[PDB]
C-alpha cells in the first residue's frame, strides 16, 4: 500500500479566515455523508451539463477550489495532533468520517485560524493505524496540496517509463476508448480513493499512462497521426466548444519511446484552467496517480507562488527537484494546432483559422471568469473563482518549454 | 495492512537481525510477571525495553554493538493516546530508552522472573508518561543532541524536544552496600516552611516504628 | 483581596526574578520558578475595609492572599 502523505493548505489570499462559507460546508461536506471521495461527483461529460455558470459556484472548477478551502480549516489533526473545530464544526469521530456541529458538553478545542499549515500523515498516530478505513483522506489532502502549492492552476505530474506500455495497461485502456476525458479522470479519481492500492497495482500504471497521453495530445505531438502505443486524445473542433477530449486508439505511426525517464511537473498557468472541464479532469487525473504513490520527488521551486517555498516534503530547490512547467491554454493550443498542421493532419490555411476558432473560444471562457470574479469579490469571505487579476489570461508562461517536454516524452 | 487485525505488531527499526522482520505476538498472555496476566504482545516490549535500558547502562564508546538500541516498537493495533495497557506504558518508555537513558536500578545481565516482575511492577505504578518524544507509527524521533546515531533508512527522524533535561555521560556500576550507609547532610538553597515540611514528613514517615534497643 | 493592580506589582516583582532562572539552576539555589498563583487562593465573600462598606463589594471566587501567605 502507501502510508505517508504530506499536505499544504490553501492560502487565505490577503484575507482573514479560510475563504469558504458555512453555506458551503453544507453544500459539499454536508448531508453528514463522508465529504471525502466526492470531489468528482460535480463534473459532467462536459461543461454544458453543469450548474457551473452564473450561480453559487460559477465555474467548472469552482467546486473543488471551494471544497479544498473547506478542507484546510478541518485538517488541524495532521497539522498538530488534535481534532479541533472551526465555527461550530468538527469531525464526528477520530476517523474523520465527516463533519458535524460541535457536540455540546465535550467540544473540541476551537481551531486556530492559520493559513498554509503543512501536514504530516504522521502527526496523527491514528491515521496509519487505520489506513484502510480513512484511506480516502489521503488521496484528498493530496488533491488539495496539488492545488495549494499553486495559485493559478493545479500542479500535477508526468511520466513515461523507457519501456513499452505494460500490456495489461494497453488492455485496460482499450476498454476506455470512446470515454470522455471527464469520465476517465472519473475512474482515475474514483479508483485511487478507497482501499490502499499498492503503487504496483495494474491500474496505477494504466491511469498514469492515461495522464501522459493526455498531455501529449494537449501539445499536438500525440495526435491522430503520432499516437502513443496506439492512443491519443482527439479534441473537439473549436467552434462548438473545443474544451473536450476523448481517448481514441488508432493505428498510425507509434511515437517511438523516449531515450530516458521523462519527469516534469506541469500546471495550467492562466486563469483559463478554472473553467476548462478538460484542463481540470486532466490535471485532477494526473493527480490521482501521485496520491497513491507518495510524490515522485520535490516539485521545483522556481516558478511557484510565494507561500510555496521549500515546503518541506513538497517543494524543493536543489537536486531532488524536477523543473516545473506551466502552459497557457491559448499559447498552448496554438502550437497544438501547428503540430497537427506539420503532420499534414490539417491544411496550411486551416491552422490560421483553427486558432481563430479556438482563440475566440478562450476569449469566451475569459469574459466569463472575469465576470464571476467581479461578481464574487473575495472580501466576501468566499473564493469560488479565486482571484487572478485581468492579466494572467494572456500570460505566455513556460508553454514553449512544455511543448518541448512533450516531444522528448514521445519521441 | 494485511495483518492489521492482529493484537499488535512489534518491529525492530534499528538494524534488524537478518533483514527487516515484523514480529507478531500471539494473543495469549504469560503467567508470572504480573498479578494481571500480561499479554504476550506487551511482555515482548518489556523484555526488550529492559534491554535498551540495561544495554545503555554499560554501552561504551570503544565498543561497537549490532544495534544502537534493542527496544521493540508497536506498529499496529496500538493505542497511542492512553497509558493503561502495560504495552502503551512500555512503548511510551521505549521512545525515551532510545536516547541512552539508563535506569537508576541496575538491570541484571540475566533478567530473572523476580527481577522482570520488579520492573513490570515499577512500570505499572502510577506515574507520568514521558512526554518529550511524541510517538509515531513509522518513525522514532531521536534527540539530535544525543549519543544515539541513526542507522540509515527512513525510520529515524531527528526530532528535538523544546527542553530535554538529560545530558550525556555514563555511570560506573558500584557493588551493593553490605550495611546501611550514613549520609552527612549538606544543604541546598530553597527551604520548606515548617508547616509544609511537617506533613510532608508525616505523609511518608514510619510513625509507630518498632525499634531494638541493643545495649547502652 | 488582591485587586487587579496589586497583582501587577507582585507579578512584576516575580517576573524580574524568574528572569534569572538559568542562574538559579546552574548554581543549585532557588527552587523552581515562583508563580504568584502559589501564594493566593480563590475564596469568595464580601470584601471591604469595614462590615459596613464591605457589604457593597460582593466578590465571587476573587483571588485573595492569606496573611501567612502575604508573609512568604
Amino acid at each position: 500500500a502507501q502510508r505517508q502523505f504530506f499536505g499544504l493548505t490553501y492560502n487565505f489570499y490577503g484575507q482573514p479566515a479560510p475563504l469558504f462559507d458555512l453555506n458551503d460546508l453544507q453544500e459539499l461536506a454536508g448531508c453528514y455523508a463522508r465529504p471525502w471521495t466526492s470531489r468528482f461527483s460535480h463534473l459532467a461529460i462536459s461543461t454544458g451539463s453543469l450548474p457551473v455558470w452564473s450561480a453559487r459556484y460559477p465555474s467548472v472548477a469552482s467546486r473543488n477550489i471551494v471544497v479544498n478551502t473547506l478542507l484546510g480549516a478541518h485538517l488541524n489533526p495532521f497539522a498538530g495532533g488534535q481534532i479541533t473545530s472551526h465555527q461550530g464544526i468538527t469531525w464526528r469521530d477520530p476517523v474523520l468520517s465527516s463533519l458535524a456541529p460541535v457536540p455540546a458538553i465535550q467540544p473540541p478545542p476551537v481551531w486556530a485560524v492559520a493559513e498554509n499549515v503543512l501536514l504530516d500523515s504522521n502527526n496523527y498516530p491514528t491515521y496509519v493505524l487505520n489506513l484502510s478505513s480513512m484511506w480516502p483522506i489521503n488521496q484528498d489532502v493530496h488533491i488539495m496540496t496539488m492545488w495549494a502549492l499553486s495559485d493559478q492552476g493545479p500542479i500535477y505530474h508526468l511520466e513515461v517509463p523507457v519501456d513499452p506500455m505494460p500490456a495489461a495497461t494497453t488492455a485496460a485502456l482499450m476498454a476506455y476508448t470512446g470515454v470522455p476525458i471527464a469520465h476517465l479522470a472519473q475512474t482515475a479519481y474514483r479508483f485511487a480513493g478507497q482501499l490502499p492500492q499498492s503503487p504496483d497495482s495494474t491500474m496505477v500504471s494504466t491511469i498514469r499512462w492515461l495522464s501522459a497521453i493526455w498531455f501529449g495530445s494537449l501539445t499536438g505531438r500525440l495526435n491522430r497521426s503520432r499516437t502513443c502505443n496506439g492512443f491519443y486524445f482527439e479534441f473537439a473542433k473549436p467552434a462548438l466548444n473545443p474544451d473536450q477530449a476523448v481517448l481514441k486508439w488508432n493505428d498510425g505511426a507509434r511515437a517511438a519511446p523516449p531515450a530516458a525517464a521523462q519527469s516534469s511537473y506541469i500546471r495550467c498557468i492562466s486563469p483559463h484552467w478554472q473553467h476548462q472541464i478538460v484542463e481540470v479532469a486532466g490535471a485532477l487525473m494526473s493527480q490521482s496517480v501521485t496520491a497513491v504513490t507518495g510524490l515522485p520527488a520535490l516539485i521545483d521551486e522556481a516558478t511557484l507562488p510565494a507561500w510555496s517555498q521549500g515546503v518541506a516534503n513538497l517543494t524543493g530547490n536543489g537536486q531532488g527537484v524536477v523543473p516545473c512547467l506551466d502552459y497557457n491554454p491559448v499559447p498552448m493550443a496554438a502550437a497544438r494546432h501547428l503540430q497537427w498542421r506539420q503532420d499534414g493532419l490539417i491544411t496550411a490555411a486551416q491552422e490560421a483559422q483553427l486558432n481563430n476558432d479556438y482563440t475566440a473560444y478562450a476569449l469566451t471562457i475569459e469574459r466569463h471568469l472575469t465576470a464571476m470574479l467581479v461578481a464574487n469579490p473575495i472580501a466576501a469571505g468566499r473564493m469560488p473563482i479565486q482571484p487572478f487579476n485581468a492579466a494572467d489570461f494572456g500570460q505566455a508562461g513556460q508553454t514553449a518549454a512544455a511543448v518541448a517536454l512533450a516531444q522528448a516524452m514521445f519521441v | 495492512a494485511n495483518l492489521a487485525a492482529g493484537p499488535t505488531v512489534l518491529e525492530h527499526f534499528d538494524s534488524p537481525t537478518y533483514g527487516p522482520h515484523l514480529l507478531l505476538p500471539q494473543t495469549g498472555d504469560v503467567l508470572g510477571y504480573s498479578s494481571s496476566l500480561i499479554s504476550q504482545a506487551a511482555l515482548l516490549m518489556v523484555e526488550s525495553v529492559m534491554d535498551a535500558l540495561r544495554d545503555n547502562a554499560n554501552a561504551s564508546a570503544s565498543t561497537a554493538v549490532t544495534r544502537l538500541d534493542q527496544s521493540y516498537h508497536p506498529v499496529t493495533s496500538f493505542d497511542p493516546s492512553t497509558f493503561n495497557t502495560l504495552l502503551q506504558r512500555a512503548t511510551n518508555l521505549a521512545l525515551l530508552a532510545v536516547q541512552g537513558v539508563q535506569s537508576e536500578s541496575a538491570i541484571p545481565a540475566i533478567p530473572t522472573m523476580s527481577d522482570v516482575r520488579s520492573f513490570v511492577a515499577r512500570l505499572m505504578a502510577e506515574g507520568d508518561p514521558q512526554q518529550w518524544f511524541p510517538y509515531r507509527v513509522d518513525q522514532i524521533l531521536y534527540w539530535p543532541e544525543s549519543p544515539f546515531v541513526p542507522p540509515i533508512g527512513p525510520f529515524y527522524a531527528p526530532f528535538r524536544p523544546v527542553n530535554f533535561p538529560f545530558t550525556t555521560g555514563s555511570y560506573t556500576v558500584v557493588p551493593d552496600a553490605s550495611r546501611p550507609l550514613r549520609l552527612l547532610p549538606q544543604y541546598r538553597n530553597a527551604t520548606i516552611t515548617v508547616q509544609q515540611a511537617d506533613d510532608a514528613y508525616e505523609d511518608t514517615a514510619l510513625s509507630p516504628l518498632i525499634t531494638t534497643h541493643g545495649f547502652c | 483581596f488582591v485587586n487587579e493592580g496589586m497583582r501587577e506589582t507582585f507579578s512584576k516583582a516575580l517576573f524580574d526574578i524568574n528572569m534569572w532562572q538559568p542562574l538559579f539552576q546552574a548554581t543549585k539555589t532557588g527552587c523552581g520558578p515562583i508563580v504568584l498563583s502559589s501564594f493566593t487562593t480563590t475564596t469568595s465573600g464580601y470584601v471591604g475595609a469595614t462590615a459596613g462598606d464591605a457589604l457593597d463589594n460582593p466578590v465571587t471566587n476573587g483571588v485573595f492572599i492569606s496573611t501567612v501567605q502575604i508573609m512568604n
Partner: peptide, 30 residues
C-alpha cells in the same frame, strides 16, 4: 500574567519545557 507569550512547540501537551517563546516574522508577542 506578564512577559512574552509562549506556546507548546512540541504541540498539545505543554510540560513547562515544551513551551517556547512564540516568535515569528513580527517579533515576539509580549
Amino acid at each position: 500574567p506578564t512577559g512574552k507569550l509562549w506556546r507548546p512547540v512540541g504541540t498539545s501537551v505543554a510540560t513547562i519545557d515544551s513551551l517556547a517563546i512564540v516568535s515569528d516574522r513580527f517579533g515576539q508577542y509580549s
